[PDB]
């Protein structure tokens, strides 16, 4: 049930000078669509979904975490921190860094969580807990960004990334509560209207974390989305580029999610 229908990947990444992964699950027949699937691609920002799921898994052991209070410093103010910088003097609780973290990519509060979890190292292991075993997170905010051609730092690949969200949202790796609390920051999310978004008619319901590093032409989202009236799709849509200043592009990322739902025979 891969790829029954063939789609034009190949030309769509050499017009934008670089490779494009994809993976799409329809999670009512299992039908997908996959595209340099299982090659690595930086994570960027996009490891903040992940990073708010093992928070809300923590939650379940731990009935006070989303409520506690946390103070920063000036110093816990990397760049893009459009939110964390607003509550400075004032602290954010830890369910409000993990809002701010998937739906403003807010990297002081995704670094503040990294804190919670023990680090890099401990986002992955909850990946691992859930059956990832091609997550890898290394570094923190800003220096997982770096992108480098080759590097396997920092990375996961568009199946991997599609699994773990279909877990996630979709089954049974948090618990209900948690589960529906996570689905609904991915749809609050406000940085991803000109990437999967783009391809999905407005009356489906919708959530993403989108990513971009900065460089190496490398940018990314995934989403789940509710068709109405079928079964939920979910996809991850990865991109990267030889040059240092190679440029990401938005459109390209919706482009492809477009390519992905005609692939699966979704009418949109
Ligand atoms: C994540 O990849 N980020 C955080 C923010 N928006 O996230 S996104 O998914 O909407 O793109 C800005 C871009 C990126 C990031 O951390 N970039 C670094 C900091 C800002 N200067 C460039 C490098």
Same mark, same amino acid.
């Given at each position: 049930?891969?790829?029954? #229908?063939?789609?034009?990947?190949?030309?769509?990444?050499?017009?934008?000078?670089?490779?494009?992964?994809?993976?799409?699950?329809?999670?009512?027949?299992?039908?997908?669509?996959?595209?340099?699937?299982?090659?690595?691609?930086?994570?960027?920002?996009?490891?903040?979904?992940?990073?708010?799921?093992? *928070? %809300?898994?923590?939650?379940?052991?731990?009935?006070? %975490?989303?409520?506690?209070?946390?103070?920063?410093?000036?110093?816990?103010? #990397?760049?893009?921190?459009?939110?964390?910088?607003?509550?400075?003097?004032?602290?954010?609780?830890?369910?409000?860094?993990?809002?701010?973290? &998937?739906?403003?990519?807010?990297?002081?509060?995704?670094?503040?969580?990294?804190?919670?979890?023990?680090?890099?190292?401990?986002?992955?292991?909850?990946?691992?807990?859930?059956?990832?075993?091609?997550?890898?997170? /290394?570094?923190?905010?800003?220096?997982?960004?770096?992108?480098?051609?080759? /590097?396997?730092?920092?990375?996961?690949?568009?199946?991997? &990334?599609?699994?773990?969200?279909?877990?996630? $949202?979709?089954?049974?790796?948090?618990?209900?509560?948690?589960?529906?609390?996570? &689905?609904?920051?991915?749809?609050?999310?406000?940085?991803?209207?000109?990437?999967?978004?783009?391809? *999905?008619?407005?009356?489906?319901?919708?959530?993403?974390? $989108?990513?971009?590093?900065?460089?190496?032409?490398?940018?990314?989202?995934?989403? *789940?989305?509710?068709?109405?009236?079928?079964?939920?799709? &979910?996809?991850?849509?990865?991109?990267?580029?030889?040059?240092? /200043?190679?440029?990401?592009?938005?459109? *390209?990322?919706?482009?492809?999610?477009?390519?992905?739902?005609?692939?699966?025979?979704?009418?949109?």
């Amino acid at each position: 049930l891969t790829n029954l #229908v063939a789609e034009p990947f190949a030309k769509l990444e050499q017009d934008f000078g670089g490779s494009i992964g994809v993976y799409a699950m329809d999670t009512g027949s299992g039908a997908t669509v996959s595209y340099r699937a299982e090659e690595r691609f930086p994570l960027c920002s996009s490891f903040k979904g992940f990073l708010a799921a093992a *928070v %809300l898994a923590r939650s379940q052991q731990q009935a006070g %975490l989303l409520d506690t209070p946390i103070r920063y410093g000036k110093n816990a103010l #990397v760049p893009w921190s459009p939110i964390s910088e607003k509550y400075l003097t004032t602290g954010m609780t830890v369910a409000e860094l993990s809002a701010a973290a &998937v739906q403003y990519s807010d990297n002081a509060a995704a670094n503040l969580l990294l804190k919670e979890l023990g680090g890099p190292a401990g986002l992955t292991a909850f990946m691992r807990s859930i059956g990832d075993t091609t997550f890898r997170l /290394d570094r923190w905010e800003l220096e997982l960004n770096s992108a480098i051609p080759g /590097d396997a730092r920092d990375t996961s690949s568009p199946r991997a &990334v599609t699994e773990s969200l279909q877990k996630l $949202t979709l089954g049974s790796a948090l618990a209900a509560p948690q589960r529906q609390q996570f &689905v609904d920051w991915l749809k609050g999310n406000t940085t991803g209207n000109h990437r999967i978004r783009a391809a *999905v008619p407005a009356d489906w319901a919708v959530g993403d974390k $989108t990513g971009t590093c900065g460089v190496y032409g490398t940018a990314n989202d995934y989403a *789940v989305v509710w068709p109405t009236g079928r079964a939920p799709i &979910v996809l991850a849509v990865y991109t990267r580029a030889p040059n240092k /200043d190679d440029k990401y592009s938005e459109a *390209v990322i919706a482009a492809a999610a477009r390519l992905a739902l005609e692939g699966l025979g979704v009418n949109g």
